[model samples]
Every structure is written in structure tokens, then in C-alpha cells.
Target: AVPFVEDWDLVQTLGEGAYGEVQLAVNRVTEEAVAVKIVDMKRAVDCPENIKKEICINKMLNHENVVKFYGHRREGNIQYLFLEYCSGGELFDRIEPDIGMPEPDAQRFFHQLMAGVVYLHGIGITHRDIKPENLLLDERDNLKISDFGLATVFRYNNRERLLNKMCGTLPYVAPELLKRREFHAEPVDVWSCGIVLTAMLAGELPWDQPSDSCQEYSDWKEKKTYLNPWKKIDSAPLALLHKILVENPSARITIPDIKKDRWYNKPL
Candidate 1:
């Protein structure tokens, strides 16, 4: 039996994936809402250490733009993680494919997304997976960063470490991850943020993957400005995108630089 199971009533399943399923639940007494992520230990392919790392990371994060982690419980082969419920749904569903949302709306959401990223980076945490599906929204439309399954603490004791794990979705992944070299964790996330911002503006990914083998990426690498999304981007955001999508991790724009960009500081 789940710890405090009698105190809450399961409402409905919110979403599901390879690891486990998230369900909407309500406190029986206070009626407060929460998301319950149930992971079957025996069935999940994720190592136990990774699951523990996810829980530790989630518990340490406490930002407005990041989902709140309440608590957790383990019962035999099943594990339960209690989380803040975001009623507005995934950010992926809000994007209008090739059309995208209005400029101001996109800017607002992008600002929130950056705020979350900035907070995480400041605390030495890096979210390796930052696709639209991992971005959620509250009822008031505030962006909430979720899913710490692939996140890691890159900085500790005033020392920064490099990561070599090849993770994250293709369209949003940074180019360095595809290579067989160790990469800085922060820039990898910044690259993903650039892709997220691009998706918000253009309503489509600039490329299927950030690799030389991918034609769209190759075209972008060759500075082919006549591409669909590239050509379509306005000069303001385009300048920032150029700095962010750079192949070299060291040359990529940092979060502070991104915040300082004129386009990013534009009044919404």
C-alpha cells in the first residue's frame, strides 16, 4: 500500500510513458490537488541510482517556474512520487505546429522558461532533457519545468564537471551530445532553450537533429538563410538564435548573455 494512500483519492491518469504513469489525485480531507507518479521498480529500465538521483534533484528544486515536488514513497516494487499538479497541460500541445503562437505570447512563455532554466543553472543543476513535452503550464498559464529524470548536478564544491551522456530528444538536443566528446552541461541546456524559443516563434523545429548527417542541420551549418524557419525569423530573435545554435559549446551563448540580448529584453 502507498504511504498516506488513505489520505488521498486517485482521480485519473494524467500521462504515461516508458518509466511510469502520472495520475491526478486529490486530498480527501483538504481537497488539494497533486500529481502522483507511480513507478514500477521491476518493470522500469532506469537504474535504481538514476531514479534516486531524479528524486534528489526534484526535491532540491524550488522555483516558481519549476514544478514542486511534495514527497515520495516506496512500497515493495512500486515507488510513488507526489508532485504539484499543473492543470493547463503540456506546452507541446499549445504550440500551433507551423503557425506558432502570437509574438507577445511566445515572449512571455519564453521568459518564464528562461527564468526556470536560469534558476536551475544557478544552483548547479542541468536538465539534459528540455523538450516541449517536459514543459508544463499551470491553470494561470505560468510555465512549469518538469521531469528531472535526465537532470544532473554539474557543479559542486565550486568545481564544474563535464558530461558525456547521450540523452534528450533529437530535435531539441545540442550538437555536442551527438559527438563522442565530453561536453559542458550548462551550454547543452542553453542550446535546448534556443530550440524551444525557436519552436515558440516558428512552430516547428529548425532540424530533426543537430548532426551533419541531417540535411536541415547541414544547411543551417552552411549558413543557408533561405530555409523555412531561418528565413522566417525576424532579425531581433534571429541574432540570438545564431549565437545559441553554434556548434562549438564554448562559443555558445550563456544564460546571462541570453538575458542581456536586446531581443530577449524587449518589452512584452
Candidate 2:
């Protein structure tokens, strides 16, 4: 019998990160495009935490708003994950040099992202790292929440350890995380949602703070919450950045609270 994926015609490279590389492929028989992400199993054995978390998290989420993993397989020491193809593009490509997306269109994208993240929280998962590179798109310009390599599963009813190992992209991290407080994953995810909204609406990152130097980062975040990044933009996004990025973890908006926000009703 022929191997299942042997006949797929390899196309261009998509992108790559620490864990592995990805390729755009086409199903030879059907002429359909697919994304293939490959990770070296041997390379990952030392970091089982990320491997397990990714598999566990990806297996649970199946939605149009989230990236899909078709199957994972081992070929010698390398592992390949066949994923649903996203042809629209990456958020970085869309935003660089600043493409001024319209507010109504941006609102739709934010709502889609929120729907995906809210669903994850409902099922007790935090996509610990949310950023431009990880947010993908399909043919329609719809969003897909990708990259669970840094996510953690948090259960509402169970007594479990909240992670403080310091994962995630620095630009979008929550303030309390810098303070060393045990936190609820959902709010941290929501805080990222606020930043995502800022990016989508304002076409820029809020702080513009350079990476590293935790103190400098914290001060910049403080300025963002109070000053408002989108205040100058004619089309503003959800007016809850202060509440969403509250320095006090206890006060940050939770998934349920975000669902009820009046701003969400504004055609988003």
C-alpha cells in the first residue's frame, strides 16, 4: 500500500519557531493545500512539558477559530503533525509597515479571537503565548488561534499549581505575572485579548517597550492602562483595556466578564 502522505506535493515554507519547522503542502490527489509542522521527537524528549501540553491542548480544541491538528506521526526520530492549512496569512505579514484595517473589520477579527480564547478558558486551557506570529488566518481572512507550545491547562474545580515558570512573549504578558502572584490563566489570556484588540484596532503594539528588563516593561504597561493606546485613533476598540490589564490579578476581567462586556455588543 502507498504511504498516506508520501504523495502530497510539498509547496513553500510557512514559518518556523523554536520547536520546529512548517511547510505548505498540497494533497496531490485532491489539489488541496495543507500545513505540515514537524518536530524532532528526540529533540523534544528533554522538553516533554511543552510536547505534552501542546498535544493535550490541541486535541481538545476543534473550531474554525482555532488551528486544527489532523494527526501526529513518528518517522524514525522525527515527529510530524499534519495540520489544517491556513492560506490567508500570518498576522505579522498583515500588520508590518502597518496595514490600516478598518474598525468594523477589526472588530470582527477581535470577536473571532475572543470566541476562540473564551472557548479555551471554558475548557480550562490558557494559550500562554499570544502574539502576531502565532495568530493565523484562512482563505477568508478569518482568524485561527495557533501555537499551544506555551499554553497550560487550568481546571476550575481542581486544586492545581498555577504555573510561574515564565513562558509567553513579553510584550503581551500580564502585570501580575511579573509580580510573582499565583494567577488564574483565563484572565491572563483575556489580558492578551486586550493587546490583540489594540493591535487589530490601532495597528501597533501599545508599549513599544523593547524586550527584556522586566522593570522597564512593567512601567510601560502601567502607562498603557492609564493613557490608552487607541485614544488617538478615530476608530477605537473595546474601552476595557484598564480593566483587562489591571495590575492586580484579582481585578482583571475573567472570561465570563468579557462575555458580558457592553462593548462586545457594538457590532463586534
Candidate 3:
């Protein structure tokens, strides 16, 4: 039995994964809410290392836009991670299927998301998996980036390295990750950010996946005029999207460039 189990009561199951589950827990003393991620190590498959990595990475992050990692506990084969409870639910739920949220709201969330990403990258870390599903909302509707299971440190001692592992949800993945080539971490994240912004603006993914097999991606690669989301996007944000979703990672807009873009700075 875990020692902290007595300190809080498991309120309800938030979600479940392959070898573990997340639950809402209420503190016995203060009555504060927290999300407890319980991982059954004995039943897990090749996840111990990743779990350790995740813990190491998450413990170091303290940005307001990033999820707060309180601490962790362990007993025998079960490991529990305590995280800040987000009462507003996933960002995915906030987005409408075909209409999306209002442009001002989208811009607000996007700015917060970018702030989180900028902080992560500034510290030499890369969040390999970025999607609406992993973005949580707090009581005031503040965007909090969560799920650092796939996050990794890409730079150390003033030196950066290329990552070869292919990870991330298909629809939000960068083309370089799909090509099985060593790629920079930041650009891939920028690509995913572009996809998220598109989803927020157009209410649907530009393509099922960033591959030639997807007609939408093919059209996008060739700069076709008839793309659904692109056609729907306004001139300013569409121009910013073009800069971000470039096929060449080197030419893709950097975070600083994005911050300077007219659309990103537009008044609501």
C-alpha cells in the first residue's frame, strides 16, 4: 500500500491507459483536489524507463502554462504521481467539431500554448506529444500542457542533438518524423503547433496525417488553392500558417518569428 493513499480519497476515475489510470483525489485535510496517476509497474511493458524520464522532466517544469507536478510515491509495484487537478477538462472538448471556438478564444489559448512551448524549448526540452487531448484547462480556462511521457531533453551544456525516434499522434506529427530521419525537436513541435492552430481555426485537421498518402497533405505540399482549412482561414493567419507548415523544417517559422507575425499579435 502506498503511504500517501491515506492522505487523500480517490474521488473518481479520470481516465485509463494501458497499464494504469488517472483518478481525481481529494485531500483528507485541506480538501484540495489533485489528479493521481497510478501506474502498475508490474503489469507495465517497457515503460519503467519512460516513467522515470517523465518524472524527471515534469519535476523540473514550473511554468504557469505547464501542469504542476506535485510529487510521486511508490509501494512495491505501484507508482503514483500527484499532479494539479484541472477542473475545466481537456482542450479537445472545448473545440467544436466543425465550427471551432471564437477567434478571440482560439487566439487566447494559442498564445498560452505557445508560451508553454517557448518555455519548454528555452530549457532545452521538447514535448514530443502535443495535442488538444494533452492540453488541460484549469478553473479560469487557463491552458496547461500535460503528459510529459514522451518529452525529452534535446540540448545540454549548450549543445543540441537530433532525435530519431518517431512519436506523436499521426494527425499532428511533422513530416520529418514520418520520414524516419534524424530531426530537430523544436521544428516538429512547431509543426504540431501549426496543426493545433489550424484545428482551432477550421474545426478539423488539415489532413488525417502529414504524409503523401493523405490527399490534403499532398495538396498542401504543392501549395494547392483548394485546401479546406486554408481556404477557410483569413489572410493574415493563413499567411502565418503557410510559414509554419512548410515542408522544409529549416524554413519553418521559428517561435520568435511566430510571435512577431501580424496575425499572432492581432487585437481581439
Candidate 4:
């Protein structure tokens, strides 16, 4: 159970940002270690509605790769969420420059990850913030996707407006996303997964795409493949990635197609 506002004792501060704090909190009832994210919602001028949405998003995710939420409580104004603690920290910290994993390891992670994304797709969920920091590892070294505040849902409104929000880490974002064009959430996710696969092999971001302008991102997208480091892929994998990050949004790779790719077409 979540400790009461006054009862919850902060352990070590895990992270602090523009509007909130993350720290380790021990459950007064279960005595389990939980990461508590205390968001000063007022500073970000966040309304109760948005806070509710964040809670809802977290609650909707039930996959093993997705993070587990014990509960969220608010007393007066401070928003507090009790989350599953990960000892391994973020995926950002786990990747090593000179000791990148082999192809099979990368394939395993990407497969497990795709299962999560496919599950999200079935529920019309979209992780607008797919980045290294948000991907955490649990006790068994399995992934636990978290931080639903930045998550996006498939809305039936103006698709253009939905794609134009220009959120998330740049390197993993799709070019169509930067163009403010109407794009499928699945394709966008596939593009990010492609980036993740590349990172799994290289242990670093493919490009230094800064979180700035969308148009510059469009420019980078136009020449991304030939940009040396950004294109750190071999002929075998290049064809697979091409289908995912292709220019034509409609023709971009889907999960079903991904399973049929050359890389996955192993001898039975």
C-alpha cells in the first residue's frame, strides 16, 4: 500500500527535474521498495484532468515490458505515484560503448520490445516518449517500460494536429512525425524500434538529432541513411530497417511485416 502523504519517507533522491522529484519510498504496509515520483503539478500548471489521464495511461499498460503501477494518490495538491522499483536503472546506463551485444541479443530485446509495442497498438496506446531513460530493467533484467505522462493515444480528431505535437527524444522520432503529417502510431513506433535495434548493436544513438526544430529533423530524415554513423547498418539489416523508416508513411513497416522480414526468417 502507498504510504500516507505524511507517512511516506523519502529514501535517496533518484531524479529531480523542472517540476518534480523521484525518490525511493518504502511501502509502510508491504515493506517493498517503490519508486515514488512526486510531481508538483502546480508548478507545471497541470490540471487534475491531465493528472488523471497520466494515471489512466499507466493503469492501461499491463504487459510485462511495461512498468507496473501500484497506485497514485493526491492529498490536497501534490501528485504521488508508487511504481515498481528497478535496480538496474535506465537502459541508458546499461549500454556500453565497446561491449555492445551481439545480433542475437539485440534480436531478443527487439522481439520482447515489439511484443510490448504490439500490445500497446492493440489497445491504441502510443508511447510518444520512447527513449533510453524510460526503458528500465527489472530484477530479471527484463524491460519495464514506464513514464506514461508523455504517452499519446490514438485520437479520432485531426490526425495532423496529433502528429504535430513534436514531443519525444529526437533520434528515435520518425521523419513523418516531424513533418506534422498525419501518420499511423504503429509506423512511428516501428521507426523508434529500428533506432533501438541500432542502439542495441552500437551502444549509442545513431545521430546527434537534437530536440529542437521539426523541419531540421525533416532535413535530417531526408539524408539519414547516408550519414555514416546514423547509418551504422549492414546490407542484411539495411533492407529490414528500410521498410520501417521508409519515406512513405503508408508503406512503412508494420508488426506483421516485421515478423516476415529476412532477419526473422530463420530456418525452422
Kindly report which residue pairs in candidate 2 clash with one another. Answer: none
Among these predictions, the greatest TM-score belongs to 3
TM-score of each: 0.94, 0.84, 0.95, 0.81
For each candidate in turn, give its C-alpha RMSD to the true structure in angstroms.
Answer: 2.3, 3.8, 2.2, 4.3
- lDDT for each residue of candidate 3 in 163-205, tens digit (9 for 90 to 100): 9988889999999888767999999999998899988888889
Clash number by candidate, in order:
0, 0, 0, 0
Question: Candidate 1, 198: how far from true, in Å?
Answer: 1.2
> On lDDT, who's better, 1 or 3?
3
Q: Which candidate, 3 or 4, has the higher TM-score? A: 3
Per-residue C-alpha lDDT of model 2 across residues 154-266, encoded as one tens digit per residue: 77566545766676766787765766757767667777777776676566776643333555445545464344344533432445654575666778777677666666667
Could you tell me how far off, in angstroms, the CA of residue 42 lies in candidate 1 after the best superposition?
1.1
Question: Each model's C-alpha lDDT?
Answer: 0.87, 0.69, 0.88, 0.70
lDDT of 1: 0.87
Tens digits of per-residue lDDT for model 1, 181-210? 799999999999899988888889999999
Ranking by lDDT: 3, 1, 4, 2
Better of 3 and 4 by lDDT: 3
Give the poorly placed runs of model 2, Cα more than 4 Å off.
Answer: 1-5, 43-49, 96-100, 156-161, 208-228, 234-238
Error of 1 at 102 (Å): 0.7
How many Å off is the CA of 212 in candidate 2? 13
